[PDB]
């Protein structure tokens, strides 16, 4: 239900942010 | 939960702004 | 809701770090 969907959206956002962080790293 | 859904929407909006304004993503 | 709220705070802080990140170009 709603709690499980919130958790999925959170997971998706966490991955989204992690990708940007990795992509903006100092070389 | 309603407040949480609210933060989530606002979070996605900040991400969209980043995705729009930054070159390096 | 406690772990969800923590995860939201952590997201927001990480998003703040991106918003205030260096301009790479």
Numbering used by the authors:
A (entry chain A): -1 to 25
B (entry chain B), C (entry chain C): 1 to 25
What does the paper say about this structure?
This is exemplified by the trimerization motif Arg(g)-h(a)-x-x-h(d)-Glu(e) (denoted R-hxxhE where h(a) = Ile, Leu, Val, Met; h(d) = Leu, Ile, Val; x = any amino acid residue) that specifies a three-stranded, parallel topology of coiled-coil domains. The trimerization driving force of the motif can be explained by optimal side chain–side chain interactions whereby the strictly conserved arginine and glutamate residues form a distinct, bifurcated, interhelical salt-bridge network and participate in the formation of the hydrophobic core by establishing tight packing interactions to the neighbouring residues at the a and d positions through their aliphatic moieties. Because of its substantial size of 18 continuous heptad repeats, we used a combination of trimer-specific determinants to switch the cortexillin-1 coiled coil from a dimer to a trimer.
Because high-resolution structural information could not be obtained for the full-length Cort-Ir-M1 trimer, the aim of the present study was to perform a detailed structural characterization of two fragments spanning the trigger sequence of the trimeric Cort-Ir-M1 coiled coil using circular dichroism, anatytical ultracentrifugation and x-ray crystallography. Tight interhelical hydrophobic contacts involve the side chain of Ile8′ at position a′ of the first trimerization motif, which is optimally shielded from solvent exposure by the aliphatic side-chain portion of Arg7. In the structure, the five introduced isoleucine residues can be accommodated in the most preferred rotamer at the hydrophobic core positions. Accordingly, the acute packing geometries of the five isoleucine residues are very similar to those seen in the crystal structure of the trimeric GCN4-pII variant, in which all a and d positions are occupied by isoleucine residues (not shown). Notably, a similar optimal packing of the hydrophobic core and the presence of an extensive network of surface salt bridges are typically observed in thermostable proteins.
